[PDB]
Write a protein that binds this ligand. Structure first.
Ligand SMILES: [Mg+2]
Ligand SMILES: [Mg+2]
Ligand SMILES: [Mg+2]
Ligand SMILES: [Mg+2]
Ligand SMILES: [Mg+2]
Ligand SMILES: [Mg+2]
Ligand SMILES: [Mg+2]
Ligand SMILES: [Mg+2]
Ligand SMILES: [Mg+2]
Ligand SMILES: [Mg+2]
Ligand SMILES: [Mg+2]
Ligand SMILES: [Mg+2]
Ligand SMILES: [Mg+2]
Ligand SMILES: [Mg+2]
Ligand SMILES: [Mg+2]
Ligand SMILES: [Mg+2]
Ligand SMILES: [Mg+2]
Ligand SMILES: [Mg+2]
Ligand SMILES: [Mg+2]
Ligand SMILES: [Mg+2]
Ligand SMILES: [Mg+2]
Ligand SMILES: [Mg+2]
Ligand SMILES: [Mg+2]
Ligand SMILES: [Mg+2]
Ligand SMILES: [Mg+2]
Ligand SMILES: [Mg+2]
Ligand SMILES: [Mg+2]
Ligand SMILES: [Mg+2]
Ligand SMILES: [Mg+2]
Ligand SMILES: [Mg+2]
Lengths: 234, 144, 142, 51, 126, 186, 103
RNA sequence: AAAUUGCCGGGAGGGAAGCGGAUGGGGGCCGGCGAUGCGCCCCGGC
RNA sequence: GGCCGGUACCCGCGCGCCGAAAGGCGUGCCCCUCGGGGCACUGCGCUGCAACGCCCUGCGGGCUCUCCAUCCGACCCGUCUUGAAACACGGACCAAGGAGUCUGACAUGCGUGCGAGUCGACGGGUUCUGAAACCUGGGAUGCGCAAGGAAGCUGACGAGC
RNA sequence: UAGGAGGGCGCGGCGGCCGAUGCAAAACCCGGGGCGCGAGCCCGGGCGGAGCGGCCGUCGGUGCAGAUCUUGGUGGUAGUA
């Protein structure tokens, strides 16, 4: 029948085009994974160089007589530690902007004066500090979800980065981890891509959540100890 | 249609949809328009401005026949002309239309006219209607 | 079907005299259609024996043994009901009968939709005739 | 004549592979992970074999 | 006559949802009616009071309405309404309607045994 | 728990299928579900979302306005998801091709004797599956008489809303609140 | 009253349920009138069933002055000028109306 | 029909009984409550 | 060690051999150069994890049904109420009856018919089961198509951002 | 909670469709087996001895635990004063 032979003609045409498409994407993926290998290589290299360099300048300044002052953290990890009941409405709006809309959410934040004075307002409600490399990488792997089409996607592969990002020159999970950790030009987009991390309740317990950390509690800066905490929120 | 009535869906809900705190008693606002100037005042002076008062002069034994003047705009006149007597015409010859044969008295003037001449014949006309007809080249005959 | 198949469907999908629906209009609802020219006796537009030009019916026959009627509608004779159905009473063996049903249903492109379901109803009908002849020998619960 | 290539493909949520101690998946995420491990292990090799 | 179902039937609750207070009074039937009271500790859902149905107690969609037979039932009144189950007997189960004669049940069950349609009422009324 | 209004689920509501159980219009809905799904033509999406309307979201569009909107664009096919009613206040009309849900037998006679083409949407979906050379027109929505009675209140200043009055006359809402000589002017 | 509505004007304060007029005998009215007409025709066979003749007159009242309709009877002046005597026009099926004036 | 009562059999009772969630022990009850068939293969006829 | 899952894709399998089997087995490049490692060219198809039990009309299996025991929970429902278990009112128990309806005007929302018209509603003709149905009239019946004025009266000259 | 809307269960008819019924209908009873989150529904057993359902459309005097509710019946009280 003319109808069915025509239908199969188009079917064969599309079947040919899918085959050639998949061959092109195989070649593309083959070259793309070498690219990713290079990027991850030189990210590890430069992380290591920065860590050694800080030590080098600190000894150099000591031997020269004075002292070196470390350049403060560009990035904060903020996790909410109070329930959503009996909150002041200003606090409710501030937490809706910081994206901490449910207890034990943890978000990555630039340090700038607007943000840190927005944290000063909800300080009894948050625990925050300066994540280190292991913290950032293992959060983004073990609990990494993407705001793709407003839907949440489990970043279980490099592919989802290619759609959410990539207009921003982020292709891989290590590109994303770097460009967060060393707070980059595209950190706005590479962070609004992420979904507010869902954390476990803190294994080993917690201290009182009512006091500031300085008074013994948990809220506010624990500047580095957000490291010692994420290991138990995760 | 009882099966759609929403009371059948309020079966089993004690109040039948009129509230526990303030109930559904008989006439808590008076029978009808009551309290027009007292407590329904906001209502009558917000949604019905002009209700209360006397305006205008009385007319004993008004007959609606004496106020009867059905109108037609100029724009409707060419519909009154059948196609074959539109074609039986030229540049100088125009169809003569007696609107009273259609039931209209006055010929108002809303709308366009074509260049085609038309000779309307009515019981009343306005300014603008005659101006439009003359400007179309047609004329006017007054009858009754 | 003077009016097309889709319109007859849209006209008879909700109440038709061949439809047996039970258990109410809830999620429990059970729907079968019981017209002869429907194969799975499922009430849907694919199978329907009324909403279609081209339908395949496979019935165990009137009083006679091992004779299966295979009938297909004629697309062009729709408005002549006495002469709408092409029936053939085949008493051959199962394999030959199934070859014939493939010939009449799939290989002429009459209606490849029902290539599998018509052979499934053929299987069930043929064994129904077998057991109507012999009796229960297997219980077929394993 | 104008409709696009039909898309019969069902793409489901594919199971979670432990991205931290499932080496077969750590690689598809971070292909450098193997080399990163290898240099460190081969570094401790010298560090310990020395003494 | 062998079930198509390949998915174990788990039920989130077997005990019935009896009306609250059906126990103390005799005029109150066992059929559930939601307490609409304003101080009704059933409605306020104190722990220790008769649980109300939610949607959360729903059963799985593919394992819904299967008897322990692992067949969905279908009530047939006569042989004509039975012969429409030939190509479903691996997922549907025919039950004879409760008001048929035994003369007609013998016919239904005769026909069902040959068409190989599982029935749960082939020992009813005999 | 989590901080959301209504659990974040959409509280607005739109028609997703017509309430009208007209068989031909369900068939159109099927046809345009297919066209919008496989075709990606925004025009077909609009035709769809406008089949899912009331009749007071689909006002009639008359010949006078239709001719206004197709002076000089007669290689483009008019598409009104609605009704086309004629107009004796028009004299010459272009030979024009238009698709619409209904044609009053006077409008359709008018157009056919103008020498144009009177389509339905099933004919349109053939010669404009993507909406090539098409002119999508709506009718005047706020033209209905009920629309007058909407807005801010009839008796608040700076509002020109029509009041609900059971007859026009002198005795019906003219005295207090309608003139300085009785009370105040609204 | 309440939300913006036309002001109520129901004339339902008397005992209107004592004077509701329902029309369920309407078909029987039609059938009764038809039998009445049939038997009048049978009695007045072969007179015309329309009854006696009537005049073309104009309606009154500016609204209707231009519409002719049937009248009650020809004036004495018509009956005289037609050669149809006063006393005899009702005899031969022509109404007579002594009250009209011809102008 | 129910409330209500009698006999017969059983169950339990240190100033209430009844109800909900666990199973445990008693009973009463379910054979679609739970199977014995599938292919190959050799006759011996059908 | 705990809980869940058990495969139509992720994995995995065959397309060669050795090996009961985990598994090993080749070539060429780069790397240190022991050990040995990195990379490499890639193709077709297939694609519901296993082993052994125990019971099988039984003194079995398990039950959403009944009774009981134990543990934890557990105030009496309806109701006005800011607050009910209330020392607030009604309620001994069962059966049946029992409470937003129907009508006129209007309004918004929606459906349907037609659409500058639409109504056939009071009448007439017909109607062989019919208080039904069907036809008819309207050229002005109602509403709409034109509004402003208190009334005499006048009554929309054609839209741009 | 007040309140609103959507989808359903149930009762009694009407217009159609599918049927059950002295080999036992309706109704009612059960420590019977189920289905549904739920209104409810399906089947078995029994009494019962003549009518009854299910579906689509459509309608209405349609869903009871209360009203010192109406009527009828029956308890404890009590073999007591
Ligand atoms: Mg612990
Ligand atoms: Mg503590
Ligand atoms: Mg409520
Ligand atoms: Mg109550
Ligand atoms: Mg209400
Ligand atoms: Mg109340
Ligand atoms: Mg209150
Ligand atoms: Mg009130
Ligand atoms: Mg109050
Ligand atoms: Mg006062
Ligand atoms: Mg309360
Ligand atoms: Mg939640
Ligand atoms: Mg003012
Ligand atoms: Mg009175
Ligand atoms: Mg009793
Ligand atoms: Mg005893
Ligand atoms: Mg208990
Ligand atoms: Mg138990
Ligand atoms: Mg009070
Ligand atoms: Mg008080
Ligand atoms: Mg007290
Ligand atoms: Mg008191
Ligand atoms: Mg009181
Ligand atoms: Mg009392
Ligand atoms: Mg009752
Ligand atoms: Mg009219
Ligand atoms: Mg504009
Ligand atoms: Mg009632
Ligand atoms: Mg009744
Ligand atoms: Mg009661």
């Amino acid at each position: 029948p003319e109808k069915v032979i025509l239908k199969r003609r188009r079917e064969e045409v599309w079947a040919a085009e899918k085959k050639q498409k998949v061959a092109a994407e195989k070649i593309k993926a083959a070259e793309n994974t070498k690219v990713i290998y290079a990027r991850a290589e030189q990210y590890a290299g430069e992380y290591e160089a920065q860590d050694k360099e800080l030590v080098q300048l600190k000894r150099e300044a000591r031997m020269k007589g004075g002292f070196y002052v470390s350049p403060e953290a560009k990035l904060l990890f903020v996790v909410r530690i109070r329930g959503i009941n009996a909150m002041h409405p200003k606090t409710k709006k501030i937490l809706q902007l910081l994206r901490l809309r449910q207890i034990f959410n943890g978000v990555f934040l630039k340090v700038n004066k607007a943000t840190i004075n927005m944290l000063r307002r909800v300080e009894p409600y948050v625990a925050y500090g300066y994540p280190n490399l292991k913290s950032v990488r293992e959060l983004i792997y073990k609990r990494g979800y993407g705001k793709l089409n407003k839907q949440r996607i489990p970043l279980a592969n490099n592919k989802v980065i290619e759609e959410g990002l990539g207009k921003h020159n982020i292709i891989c999970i290590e590109d994303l981890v770097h460009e967060i950790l060393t707070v980059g030009p595209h950190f706005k987009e590479a962070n609004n891509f992420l979904w507010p991390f869902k954390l476990k309740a803190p294994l080993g317990g917690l201290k009182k959540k009512r006091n500031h950390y300085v008074e013994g509690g948990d809220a506010g800066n624990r500047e580095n100890y957000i490291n010692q905490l994420v290991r138990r929120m995760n | 249609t009882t099966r759609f009535k929403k009371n059948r869906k309020k079966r089993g809900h004690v109040s039948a949809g009129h509230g526990r705190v303030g109930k559904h008693r008989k006439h808590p606002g008076g029978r009808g328009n009551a309290g027009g100037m007292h407590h329904h005042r906001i209502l009558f002076d917000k949604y019905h401005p002009g209700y209360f008062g006397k305006v205008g002069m009385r007319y004993f034994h008004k007959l609606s026949n004496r106020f009867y003047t059905p109108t037609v705009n100029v724009e409707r006149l060419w519909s009154m002309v059948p196609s074959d007597k539109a074609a039986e015409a030229g540049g100088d010859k125009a169809p003569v239309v007696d609107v009273s044969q259609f039931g209209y008295f006055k010929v108002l003037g809303k709308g366009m006219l074509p260049e085609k001449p038309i000779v309307v014949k009515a019981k009343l006309i306005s300014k603008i209607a005659e101006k439009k007809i003359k400007a179309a080249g047609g004329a006017v005959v007054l009858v009754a | 079907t003077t009016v097309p198949g889709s319109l007859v469907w849209e006209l008879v999908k909700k109440n038709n005299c061949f439809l047996i629906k039970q258990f109410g209009n809830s999620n429990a609802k059970v729907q079968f259609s019981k017209e002869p020219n429907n194969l799975y006796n499922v009430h849907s537009y694919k199978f329907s024996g009324l909403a279609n030009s081209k339908t395949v019916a496979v019935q165990p026959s009137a009083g006679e043994d091992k004779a299966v009627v295979l009938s297909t509608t004629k697309t062009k004779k729709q408005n002549t009901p006495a002469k709408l159905q092409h029936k053939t009473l085949m008493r051959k063996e199962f394999r030959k009968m199934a070859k014939s049903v493939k010939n009449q249903v799939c290989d002429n492109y009459y209606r490849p939709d029902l290539t599998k379901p018509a052979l499934a109803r053929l299987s069930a009908v043929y064994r129904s005739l077998q057991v109507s002849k012999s009796g229960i020998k297997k219980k077929n619960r394993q | 004549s104008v409709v696009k290539p039909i898309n019969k493909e069902v793409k489901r949520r594919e199971a979670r592979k432990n991205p931290l101690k499932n080496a077969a998946a750590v690689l598809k995420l971070n292909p450098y992970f193997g080399t990163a491990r290898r240099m460190a292990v081969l570094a401790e090799a010298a560090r310990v074999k020395a003494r | 006559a062998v079930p198509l179902l390949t998915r174990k039937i788990v039920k989130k609750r077997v005990k019935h949802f009896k009306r609250a207070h059906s126990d103390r009074y005799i005029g109150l039937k066992q059929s559930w009616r939601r307490p609409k009271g304003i101080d009704s500790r059933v409605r306020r859902k104190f722990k220790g009071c008769t649980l109300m149905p939610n949607i959360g107690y729903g059963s799985d969609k593919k394992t819904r309405h299967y008897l322990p037979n692992k067949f969905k039932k279908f009530v047939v009144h006569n042989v004509s309404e039975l012969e429409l189950l030939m190509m479903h007997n691996r997922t549907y189960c025919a039950e004879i309607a409760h008001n048929v004669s035994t003369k007609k049940r013998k016919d239904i069950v005769e026909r069902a045994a040959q068409l190989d349609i599982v029935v749960t009422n082939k020992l009813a009324r005999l | 728990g989590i901080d959301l209004v209504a659990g974040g689920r959409n509280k607005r509501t739109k028609r997703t299928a017509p309430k009208s159980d007209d068989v031909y219009l369900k068939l159109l809905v099927k046809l345009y579900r297919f066209l919008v799904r496989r075709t990606k033509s925004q025009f077909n999406a609009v035709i769809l979302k406008r089949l899912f309307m009331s009749k007071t979201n689909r006002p009639p569009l008359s010949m006078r306005r239709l001719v206004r909107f197709m002076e000089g664009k007669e290689d483009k096919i008019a598409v009104i998801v609605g009704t086309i009613t004629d107009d004796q206040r028009v004299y010459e009309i272009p030979a024009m091709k238009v698709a619409a849900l209904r044609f009053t037998e006077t409008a359709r006679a008018r157009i056919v004797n103008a020498g144009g083409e009177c389509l339905t949407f099933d004919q349109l979906a053939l010669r404009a599956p993507l909406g090539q050379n098409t002119l999508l027109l709506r009718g005047p929505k706020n033209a209905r008489e009920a629309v007058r009675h909407f807005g801010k209140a009839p008796g608040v200043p700076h509002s020109h809303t029509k009041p609900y009055v059971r007859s026009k006359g002198r005795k019906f809402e003219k005295a207090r609140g309608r003139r300085n000589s009785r009370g105040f002017k609204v | 009253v309440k939300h913006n509505n036309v002001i109520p004007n129901g004339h339902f304060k008397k005992h209107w349920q004592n004077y509701v007029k329902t029309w369920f005998n309407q078909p029987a009215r039609k059938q009764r009138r038809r039998i009445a007409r049939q038997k009048k025709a049978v009695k007045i066979f072969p007179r015309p069933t329309s009854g006696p003749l009537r005049p073309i007159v104009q309606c009154q009242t500016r609204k209707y002055n231009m519409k002719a309709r049937a009248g009650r009877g020809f004036t004495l002046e018509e009956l005289k000028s037609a050669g149809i005597p006063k006393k005899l026009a009702p005899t031969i099926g022509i109404s007579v109306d002594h009250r009209r004036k011809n102008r």
